[PDB]
C-alpha cells in the first residue's frame, strides 16, 4: 500500500527469527530505536504490529522519532521515544515502470499536524485561503493527494525505497512473539547444568522407568524437589539426580 494508505496488521503467538534479517545483506537503512538488534531476540515484548508503505529514497530519514518534515508531519508520524526498528531496501527492479510509476500517493497538505500512529484517509481538500472549495479545484483548493513518479532511470535519491516499520510496546497481557532460544543437544550420565523451558538446575541426566501422563512437563518427588524432567524435543522422560558431592 501507499504511504497515505499504510496498513496496520497484527502478528502474535508465534516465533520470528530476527537473526536472518540482520545478515539478509539487502537492507539499506536498517535502523533500530530504543533497542539494539542483538538483544532483540533474547527479550521480547508485546504489541508487535507492523506497518508497510513505500517511501522515496530522499525522504527516508524523515521517518524517525522526534523527526518532522513533509511525510513525517502529514502522512505518518512516529511517536517520541519510539521502541522499534525500521527496515528499508531499494526496489528499483520491481517497484518501477517505464514512464513513471504513478501508483503511490501521499498527503501534501493537512489542516493540522498528524498525531503519532494516526491513519488518515479522506476525500476532502485543503483550504489555503478563506474561500471554501465546493469540490471544484481552484486557486486555493490544492487537492493534497498527489501521485509519485518513479521511473527506472530516476536517481538514487529519488528511487522508491521499499520500507517497513516494526514497533514494540507494553501491555498487561502475556508476552507475544519471541525468538527461538537455540536449543542445544542433551548429554547423559554427566553432571551437566540444564535449563529447560522454565526450570533450570545442575545434576546427572539418566534414563527413567517412570511414565508421565501426556500433559506433564517435569516431575518432583518430595519437598518440591525436581527430579524427573521430560525434554520437549524428544518426549522422553529422564531422571535428574544431584551429582557426586560430600565431605572428604
Amino acid at each position: 500500500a501507499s504511504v497515505y494508505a499504510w496498513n496496520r496488521k497484527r502478528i502474535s503467538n508465534c516465533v520470528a527469527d530476527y537473526s536472518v534479517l540482520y545478515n539478509s545483506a539487502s537492507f539499506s537503512t536498517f535502523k533500530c530505536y530504543g533497542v539494539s538488534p542483538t538483544k532483540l531476540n533474547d527479550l521480547c515484548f508485546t504489541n508487535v504490529y507492523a506497518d508497510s508503505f513505500v517511501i522515496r529514497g530522499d525522504e527516508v530519514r524523515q521517518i524517525a522519532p522526534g523527526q518532522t518534515g513533509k511525510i513525517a508531519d502529514y502522512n505518518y508520524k512516529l511517536p517520541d521515544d519510539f521502541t522499534g526498528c525500521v527496515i528499508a531496501w531499494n526496489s528499483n527492479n520491481l517497484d518501477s515502470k517505464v514512464g513513471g510509476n504513478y501508483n503511490y500517493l501521499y498527503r501534501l497538505f493537512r489542516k493540522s499536524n498528524l498525531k503519532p500512529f494516526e491513519r488518515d484517509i479522506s476525500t476532502e481538500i485543503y483550504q489555503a485561503g478563506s474561500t471554501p472549495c465546493n469540490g471544484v479545484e481552484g486557486f486555493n483548493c490544492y487537492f493534497p493527494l498527489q501521485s509519485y513518479g518513479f521511473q527506472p532511470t530516476n536517481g538514487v535519491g529519488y528511487q522508491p525505497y521499499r520500507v517497513v516499520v516494526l514497533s514494540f510496546e507494553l501491555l498487561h497481557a502475556p508476552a507475544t512473539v519471541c525468538g527461538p532460544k537455540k536449543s542445544t543437544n542433551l548429554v547423559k550420565n554427566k553432571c551437566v547444568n540444564f535449563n529447560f523451558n522454565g526450570l533450570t538446575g545442575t545434576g546427572v541426566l539418566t534414563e527413567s522407568n517412570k511414565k508421565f501422563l501426556p500433559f506433564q512437563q517435569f516431575g518432583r518427588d518430595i519437598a518440591d524437589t525436581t527430579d524427573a524432567v521430560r525434554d520437549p524435543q524428544t518426549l522422553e522422560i529422564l531422571d535428574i539426580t544431584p551429582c557426586s558431592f560430600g565431605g572428604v
Partner: protein, 596 residues
C-alpha cells in the same frame, strides 16, 4: 489568513507539479538527441505544448498575489520568475508571429551552402564544409569568397525578417514594465529587496564598460603581436598600418582564434604540450578518459559522480542509422537524473572538453535541495563559468604529469609557458572585445532609437575601433551580416560569455589562494586541496536562493566586478608581449587604408 502563507502553499503545490512535467519533457528531449526518427519530431509538439501551457496557467494564478507584503526573500524571488508573463501580453494575432518567424529562420541557418555560383559542383553542411575550408586553408582569394558564401547567401534574406523580429519583441518590455527588450535580459543580474546589495538593471552597462578599460591595453599588445605573426606568410599582401581582415581570424566571426596555431606559432622549435600519442600508446578508451576526470573532482572535495550515468548515458557514436547530433552539452533531467551528451574521441580538445562538461553536472546537484524554480544558477553567467575553471587546471603541466599523460621529464622553461599561456589568451582574452561590442549592438538596436538606414554603418565603425578588424570588401546597407552569427540570430543572451572570463578567473584566484599554492597562477592546481573544495561547495549550493552578488563576496570578498585578478594570470605573458612589440605599431585608429 495571510498572503505569505498562501504564497507558500501555492509554491509547494507548483514545485511538485512542475518537476513532474519537466522530467517527462526532459527525458523525451534526451532520446531525440540519441535516436532521431520521423515520429520523434511529432512527439515534441505533444510534449512541448502542454509543458509550455502549464506555465501559462500557473503564471496567471500567481499574478493576483501582491508583492508588497512578502518579507521572505526565498519565495519573493520564486514569485518574481513565475509571474513573468512573457508572450501572454502579446495578442493572439501578434503572438503567432513568434513561432512563425523563429522556426523559419532556424531552418535557414541550418542550410550549409558553399557551392560556387555558376559552378554547382558540390557543397556540404556547416560543420563539414565551412570549418575545414577556413581553419586549414591559407589562401586569401578563396577565403574572401567563403566569407561572402555565408554573409551574402544566408544573411541577405534575414534583413526583412530580423527587423520584424526586433520591433515586436521590443514592445513586450512596456507590457512587462521593462525599459526595452535589451533591458529585459539585464533583469537576470538585477537584485532587489536587499539593502545595500541591490543591483540596478542599468548598473550592468557601466560595470561592463568600466572593466573594459583595463582589458584594452592587454588587447592592444595582443593584437599588435598577433598581427605581426600574420604578415610572416603575407609580407606585402596586407599593409602593416591598419587592422586585420575579418576572414583571417580562424573562425567565420573570429570568436575563437584557435585555428591560428599553425600560422602564429610563437616558438615551434621545441615540442608543444601534446599527449595525444601518449594515451593511444597506453590504450585509453572512453571509460578511462572520463574515470580519471571523476577522481579529479572527488580529490578536490566535491562529491563523486553518481552511478546512473555510466549505464544510462552514451559515450561514443552508437550504431550507423543513428545520425543524431552529439554536441557537448549538460543535461539536467531532474529527479536525480543527470546525463552527459557528447561523442568521445581521441583528441586533445575532447579530453579537455570531458573535464569541462562534468563541471555543469556537478553544479546541478549543488542546488538540488533548492526548489524547482530556484533549481538553477545564480545568473546566466555563473552556470558557464563554473564549468570552465577545472578545464584551465586540467591543461596545466602539473596536473597532466600527476596522472601520467605527460612525460615524467618535461622541463618548464620560458618558451614552454608562453606558448601555452598565449593560446589560452587568444581563446579567452582575444574574444572579449568581440563579445562586448556585439552585446552593445544588441542593447542599442533593441532600444529603438536607431533609424533603419544606420543599422549597419554603426555596426562596422565600432568593430574597427574596439575589435580592430577592417572590412575585406565594402557592403551596402541591404546586407544583414550582423544577424548571421549563431547566438544573436537564435536569441541567446551573449553577455554570459563576457562575464564568463571575469567569473572563472575571480574564482580561480580565490581557490588557488585557498590551496595556498606557491607560485604563479598559470602553474596553480586545484586537486589535492580539500579546503578549496569546501569554499566552492559553500557558494555552489546557494543557487538562486541567495543574490548572485552575495556569491562573489563568499569567494573573493569583492562585491563589484573585479577585473584585476585576470592580468595577474597573464603577467608573465604581458611582460614578454611588451618587449616583443617594441617596433610593432601598437594602437590602431580609424583605418581605411587597406580597402579605401
Amino acid at each position: 489568513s495571510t498572503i505569505e502563507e498562501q504564497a507558500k502553499t501555492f509554491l509547494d503545490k507548483f514545485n511538485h507539479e512542475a518537476e513532474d512535467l519537466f522530467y517527462q519533457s526532459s527525458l523525451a528531449s534526451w532520446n531525440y538527441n540519441t535516436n532521431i526518427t520521423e515520429e520523434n519530431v511529432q512527439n515534441m509538439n505533444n510534449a512541448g505544448d502542454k509543458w509550455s501551457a502549464f506555465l501559462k496557467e500557473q503564471s496567471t494564478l500567481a499574478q493576483m498575489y501582491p508583492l508588497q507584503e512578502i518579507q521572505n526573500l526565498t519565495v519573493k524571488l520564486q514569485l518574481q520568475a513565475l509571474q513573468q508573463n512573457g508572450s501572454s501580453v502579446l495578442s493572439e494575432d501578434k503572438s503567432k508571429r513568434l513561432n512563425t518567424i523563429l522556426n523559419t529562420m532556424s531552418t535557414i541557418y541550418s542550410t550549409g551552402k558553399v557551392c560556387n555560383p555558376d559552378n554547382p559542383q558540390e557543397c556540404l553542411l556547416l560543420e563539414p564544409g565551412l570549418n575545414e575550408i577556413m581553419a586549414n586553408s591559407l589562401d586569401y582569394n578563396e577565403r574572401l569568397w567563403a566569407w561572402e558564401s555565408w554573409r551574402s547567401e544566408v544573411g541577405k534574406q534575414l534583413r526583412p525578417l530580423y527587423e520584424e523580429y526586433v520591433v515586436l519583441k521590443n514592445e513586450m518590455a512596456r507590457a512587462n514594465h521593462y525599459e526595452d527588450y535589451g533591458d529585459y535580459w539585464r533583469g537576470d543580474y538585477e537584485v532587489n529587496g536587499v539593502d545595500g546589495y541591490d543591483y540596478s538593471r542599468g548598473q550592468l552597462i557601466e560595470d561592463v564598460e568600466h572593466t573594459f578599460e583595463e582589458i584594452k591595453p592587454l588587447y592592444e599588445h595582443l593584437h599588435a603581436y598577433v598581427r605581426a605573426k600574420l604578415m610572416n606568410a603575407y609580407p606585402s599582401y596586407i599593409s602593416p598600418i591598419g587592422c586585420l581582415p575579418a576572414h583571417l581570424l580562424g573562425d567565420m566571426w573570429g570568436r575563437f582564434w584557435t585555428n591560428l596555431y599553425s600560422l602564429t606559432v610563437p616558438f615551434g622549435q621545441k615540442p608543444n604540450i601534446d599527449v595525444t600519442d601518449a594515451m593511444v600508446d597506453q590504450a585509453w578508451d572512453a571509460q578511462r578518459i572520463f574515470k580519471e576526470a571523476e577522481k579529479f573532482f572527488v580529490s578536490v572535495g566535491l562529491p563523486n559522480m553518481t552511478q546512473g550515468f555510466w549505464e544510462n548515458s552514451m559515450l561514443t557514436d552508437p550504431g550507423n542509422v543513428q545520425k543524431a547530433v552529439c554536441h557537448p552539452t549538460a543535461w539536467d533531467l531532474g529527479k536525480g537524473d543527470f546525463r552527459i551528451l557528447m561523442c568521445t574521441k581521441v583528441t586533445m580538445d575532447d579530453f579537455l572538453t570531458a573535464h569541462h562538461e562534468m563541471g555543469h553536472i556537478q553544479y546541478d546537484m549543488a542546488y538540488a535541495a533548492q526548489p524547482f524554480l530556484l533549481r538553477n544558477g545564480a545568473n546566466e553567467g555563473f552556470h558557464e563559468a563554473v564549468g570552465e575553471i577545472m578545464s584551465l587546471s586540467a591543461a596545466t603541466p602539473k596536473h597532466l604529469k600527476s596522472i601520467g599523460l605527460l612525460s615524467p621529464d618535461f622541463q618548464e622553461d620560458n618558451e614552454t609557458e608562453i606558448n601555452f599561456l598565449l593560446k589560452q589568451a587568444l581563446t579567452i582574452v582575444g574574444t572579449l572585445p568581440f563579445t562586448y561590442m556585439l552585446e552593445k549592438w544588441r542593447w542599442m538596436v533593441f532600444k529603438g532609437e536607431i533609424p533603419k538606414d544606420q543599422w549597419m554603418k554603426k555596426w562596422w565603425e565600432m568593430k574597427r575601433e574596439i575589435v580592430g578588424v577592417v572590412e575585406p570588401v565594402p557592403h551596402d546597407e541591404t546586407y544583414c551580416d550582423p544577424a548571421s552569427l549563431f547566438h544573436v540570430s537564435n536569441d541567446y543572451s551573449f553577455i554570459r560569455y563576457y562575464t564568463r572570463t571575469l567569473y572563472q578567473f575571480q574564482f580561480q584566484e580565490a581557490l588557488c589562494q585557498a590551496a595556498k599554492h606557491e607560485g604563479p597562477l598559470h602553474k596553480c592546481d586545484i586537486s589535492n586541496s580539500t579546503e578549496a573544495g569546501q569554499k566552492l561547495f559553500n557558494m555552489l549550493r546557494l543557487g538562486k536562493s541567495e543574490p548572485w552578488t552575495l556569491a562573489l563576496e563568499n569567494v573573493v570578498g569583492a562585491k563589484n566586478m573585479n577585473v584585476r585578478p585576470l592580468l595577474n594570470y597573464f603577467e608573465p605573458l604581458f611582460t614578454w608581449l611588451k618587449d616583443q612589440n617594441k617596433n610593432s605599431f601598437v594602437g590602431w585608429s580609424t583605418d581605411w587604408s587597406p580597402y579605401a
